[PDB]
Amino acid sequence: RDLSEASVYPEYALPKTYNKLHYCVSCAIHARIVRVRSREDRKNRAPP
Amino acid sequence: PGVSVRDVAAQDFINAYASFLQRQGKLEVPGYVDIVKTSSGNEMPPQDAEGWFYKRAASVARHIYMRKQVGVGKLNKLYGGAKSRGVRPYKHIDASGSINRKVLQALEKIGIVEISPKGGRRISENGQRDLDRIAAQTLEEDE
Amino acid sequence: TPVTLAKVIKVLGRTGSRGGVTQVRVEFLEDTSRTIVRNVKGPVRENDILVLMESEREARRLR
Amino acid sequence: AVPSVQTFGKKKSATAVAHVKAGKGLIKVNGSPITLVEPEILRFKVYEPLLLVGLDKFSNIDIRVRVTGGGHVSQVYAIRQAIAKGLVAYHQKYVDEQSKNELKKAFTSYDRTLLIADSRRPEPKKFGGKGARSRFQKSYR
Amino acid sequence: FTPVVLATPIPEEVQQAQTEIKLFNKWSFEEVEVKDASLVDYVQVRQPIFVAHTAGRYANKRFRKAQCPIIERLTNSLMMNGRNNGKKLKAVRIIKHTLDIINVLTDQNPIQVVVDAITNTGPREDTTRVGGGGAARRQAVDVSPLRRVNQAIALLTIGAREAAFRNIKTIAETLAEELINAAKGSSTSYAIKKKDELERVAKSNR
Amino acid sequence: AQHAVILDQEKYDRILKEVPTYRYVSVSVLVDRLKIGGSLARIALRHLEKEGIIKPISKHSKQAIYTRAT
RNA sequence: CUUAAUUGCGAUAACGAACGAGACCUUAACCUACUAAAUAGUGGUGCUAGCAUUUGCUGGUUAUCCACUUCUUAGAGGGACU
RNA sequence: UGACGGAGCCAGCGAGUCUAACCUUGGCCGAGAGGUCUUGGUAAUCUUGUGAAACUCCGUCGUGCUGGGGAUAGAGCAUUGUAAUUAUUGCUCUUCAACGAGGAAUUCCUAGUAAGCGCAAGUCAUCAGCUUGCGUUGAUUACGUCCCUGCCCUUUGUACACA
């Protein structure tokens, strides 16, 4: 509201970018939080 | 006031009655005044360079009849030094016990210090006829 | 010093991997909904007022 | 009137008994006045039940309490409690309680653990250290 | 006021003050209510004491941490180094001393502005020891109303050995100038500049 | 000598000449004055034991309460 | 989810349990209510010196009748069981 | 908020002589160390009211290696032991220093407890700078957590089992 009161043509965008990524197997479990799964629970596909 | 035996204060009392005994003519010393350190743990000679056995007329003899029967080493027990015994604890240390045993035969001649059974010394009928009326005198010169 | 008269609104919880920062809510009850998501240093028992300088200057995770 | 109720100044370091009888209001620690109790300063926490709800509180009572043993805290509270038990546990049995409790504007208003029995008690020292919860320090090779 | 006169020894100077109004003989323990703002209901003042001895259960209950005497919480908060620690009936007469040095140098009969020792030594924000990693991390939280009881008492009293010991000068007189100097604007003192490093990066980094 | 000597016969009675703008007479203050020392400083300051400008109401040793009083 | 806890609740091919721990027990303790009083502690006072008469106080009396069980000490029990 | 000198003055734990000599107030002596007749006790009897130190109050000391300190060696007097030198300990004087808050190294502990100081007992003829307890005075701030260190549980992996 005071970042873009300076911005005439008010706020112009709600600006949003897109990025698609490609990790690998050998670097995913050193950032992204899975790092293991058990035997009989490896079955779902929806993330929640 | 109905001045009892135990209305007697402790420091402003001895400031204004033991100093009165300074000039009663009372020498009564063993000749060993200002040669004694008054503690084994003491490192310096005492204060006045003469006397100061005049505290005994209001510190010691007032404290004999606070109790009922006294000895000497318990009256020696008030003088408590701590000789810095090298690098060691500063243990229970008293003075030299000759002075209190010779005040025991110096102010006895007045009538204040009388011979006691039940151990050592007790107070006399100079207590109830002068020491009561120097509680009726020192507190009644300092009302 | 724009003194936002802060208050202990609710009893939020803890943060601190060395166990040092204890979480509360901090704003003045008139004109809410403009508040630092921020905590108190040490001991606070429940639900009383507070004096400060800042009003809305936030941070999220506090080790 | 002297029926001696066996009230007590009991704390960490006093096994005392208060024979609070009825006289003019004199007080002796076996002979001792109020100006001789050996702190010279902590004497003035004996303020509480005397000159804060009433002026006199004298002709009703009389105090003569002994103390033997112990250390150097019980000259302040356990002297005080023995004297203070002679007022509200003797103006309760004979004198009424509304006369006691409505004129109890200061007997309980500053009740800094007076009549409640103390519950702060010695515990034995451990083994393997300097103190009761003070240990040594170790060393490795 | 028609006092009581009696044969057993009770003097006069006590009964003409405390039988109706709360005070001491020459000290003030008078009508001063809380001139400072909140932290009220956390202070021993209401109810003020006359001389200093009050102990009890104040050990680890977090949720009654403020009814204990801050009179008493002051009077044992400087003692250390093997001979001052313990021995805790030796500052009892310096409150009989240094509440007569301020009460002789710009009198302000003592209970008026010493209850107001939150006016100057009451902080506004405190910088944390938060983790971060790498620097002198004092990314902060906002202040708390009981740190102004523990950090208040300490940093105005622990400086009574950095200025007194190793040489001749005593404890009492620097508890008089630097009470008023820590009750007014100072610019040349111990409190406010040591009240800077826990407020320096309270505004220069949010 | 340099410090802690006897009475300063040159300028002695500052107690009756120099107690505006400095209300400070004690052990803890009067040693940077290029003054006689507490071996003989306050021994030379108990000359006003009857009355004086500086007045104690505290009778204790080793430091007293001496300011501009009446 | 809680806790000092494999402690409890709740979910449940499990049910019901034997342990340890917990529990249990102490102690510096409250009991002037007790069976109970100078090898131990009490208001009194036999003989009562004296300050002081503001009339009962400081008292003592290797025991004088000993006045008396609460302080000293615990026989079982209460009181507290978050 | 210390040191010296005066005034006041506090614990509980005990363990104490047997056909022998342990705890012991005193009397008297000498400055002490201590010594001879005595004071009670095989023990809520006497020590010991463990008035001690640390403590409270009032006079004397000053910026120094000092009225803080007592290392170092020297002489003398006593105590214990058939027996003390390579010194059992104390006592009185000669000797009177270092050391100034202490480096990459690194512990303990959250209320009569952290802390202050000091007495019994244990080894004890004599030898506490030690260790258990006994006590006398008593704050703190975290109010809890995984980076460092340590331990238990689920899941996976393991070519290992004196793992």
UniProtKB/Swiss-Prot annotation, chain A:
It comes from the Eukaryota. It is found in: Cytoplasm. Component of the small ribosomal subunit (SSU). Mature yeast ribosomes consist of a small (40S) and a large (60S) subunit. The 40S small subunit contains 1 molecule of ribosomal RNA (18S rRNA) and 33 different proteins (encoded by 57 genes). The large 60S subunit contains 3 rRNA molecules (25S, 5.8S and 5S rRNA) and 46 different proteins (encoded by 81 genes). eS26 interacts with eS1 forming part of the mRNA exit tunnel. eS26 interacts with TSR2. Present with 503000 molecules/cell in log phase SD medium. Component of the ribosome, a large ribonucleoprotein complex responsible for the synthesis of proteins in the cell. The small ribosomal subunit (SSU) binds messenger RNAs (mRNAs) and translates the encoded message by selecting cognate aminoacyl-transfer RNA (tRNA) molecules. The large subunit (LSU) contains the ribosomal catalytic site termed the peptidyl transferase center (PTC), which catalyzes the formation of peptide bonds, thereby polymerizing the amino acids delivered by tRNAs into a polypeptide chain. Belongs to the eukaryotic ribosomal protein eS26 family. This is Small ribosomal subunit protein eS26B. The chain holds residues 51 to 98 of 119 of the full protein.
Swiss-Prot record, chain C:
It is found in: Cytoplasm. GO terms for biological process: maturation of SSU-rRNA; positive regulation of nuclear-transcribed mRNA catabolic process, deadenylation-dependent decay; ribosomal small subunit assembly; ribosomal subunit export from nucleus; translation. Its main location: cytoplasm. GO terms for molecular function: structural constituent of ribosome. One of its GO terms (cellular component) is cytosolic small ribosomal subunit. Pfam families: Ribosomal_S28e. The keyword Coiled coil does not apply. The keyword Cell wall biogenesis/degradation does not apply. Keywords: Acetylation, Cytoplasm, Ribonucleoprotein, Ribosomal protein. Transmembrane segments: none annotated. InterPro entries: NA-bd_OB-fold (IPR012340), Ribosomal_eS28 (IPR000289), Ribosomal_eS28_CS (IPR028626). Component of the small ribosomal subunit (SSU). Mature yeast ribosomes consist of a small (40S) and a large (60S) subunit. The 40S small subunit contains 1 molecule of ribosomal RNA (18S rRNA) and 33 different proteins (encoded by 57 genes). The large 60S subunit contains 3 rRNA molecules (25S, 5.8S and 5S rRNA) and 46 different proteins (encoded by 81 genes). Present with 94500 molecules/cell in log phase SD medium. PANTHER family: 40S RIBOSOMAL PROTEIN S28, SMALL RIBOSOMAL SUBUNIT PROTEIN ES28. Belongs to the eukaryotic ribosomal protein eS28 family. This is Small ribosomal subunit protein eS28A. It comes from Saccharomyces cerevisiae (strain ATCC 204508 / S288c). The lineage of its organism: Eukaryota, Fungi, Dikarya, Ascomycota, Saccharomycotina.
UniProtKB/Swiss-Prot annotation, chain E:
Belongs to the universal ribosomal protein uS7 family. Component of the ribosome, a large ribonucleoprotein complex responsible for the synthesis of proteins in the cell. The small ribosomal subunit (SSU) binds messenger RNAs (mRNAs) and translates the encoded message by selecting cognate aminoacyl-transfer RNA (tRNA) molecules. The large subunit (LSU) contains the ribosomal catalytic site termed the peptidyl transferase center (PTC), which catalyzes the formation of peptide bonds, thereby polymerizing the amino acids delivered by tRNAs into a polypeptide chain. It is found in: Cytoplasm. Component of the small ribosomal subunit (SSU). Mature yeast ribosomes consist of a small (40S) and a large (60S) subunit. The 40S small subunit contains 1 molecule of ribosomal RNA (18S rRNA) and 33 different proteins (encoded by 57 genes). The large 60S subunit contains 3 rRNA molecules (25S, 5.8S and 5S rRNA) and 46 different proteins (encoded by 81 genes). The keyword Transmembrane does not apply. Keywords: Acetylation, Cytoplasm, Isopeptide bond, Phosphoprotein, Ribonucleoprotein, Ribosomal protein, Ubl conjugation. N-terminally acetylated by acetyltransferase NatA. This is Small ribosomal subunit protein uS7. GO terms for cellular component: 90S preribosome; cytoplasm; cytosol; cytosolic small ribosomal subunit; ribosome. One of its GO terms (molecular function) is structural constituent of ribosome.
Swiss-Prot record, chain F:
It is found in: Cytoplasm. The keyword Cytoplasm applies. GO terms for cellular component: cytosol; cytosolic small ribosomal subunit. One of its GO terms (biological process) is cytoplasmic translation. The keyword Nucleus does not apply. Keywords: Cytoplasm, Methylation, Ribonucleoprotein, Ribosomal protein. GO terms for molecular function: structural constituent of ribosome. It comes from the Eukaryota. Belongs to the eukaryotic ribosomal protein eS25 family. It is presumed that the precursor part of S25 is engaged in assembling of the small subunit, thus being essential in ribosome maturation. Component of the ribosome, a large ribonucleoprotein complex responsible for the synthesis of proteins in the cell. The small ribosomal subunit (SSU) binds messenger RNAs (mRNAs) and translates the encoded message by selecting cognate aminoacyl-transfer RNA (tRNA) molecules. The large subunit (LSU) contains the ribosomal catalytic site termed the peptidyl transferase center (PTC), which catalyzes the formation of peptide bonds, thereby polymerizing the amino acids delivered by tRNAs into a polypeptide chain. Component of the small ribosomal subunit (SSU). Mature yeast ribosomes consist of a small (40S) and a large (60S) subunit. The 40S small subunit contains 1 molecule of ribosomal RNA (18S rRNA) and 33 different proteins (encoded by 57 genes). The large 60S subunit contains 3 rRNA molecules (25S, 5.8S and 5S rRNA) and 46 different proteins (encoded by 81 genes).
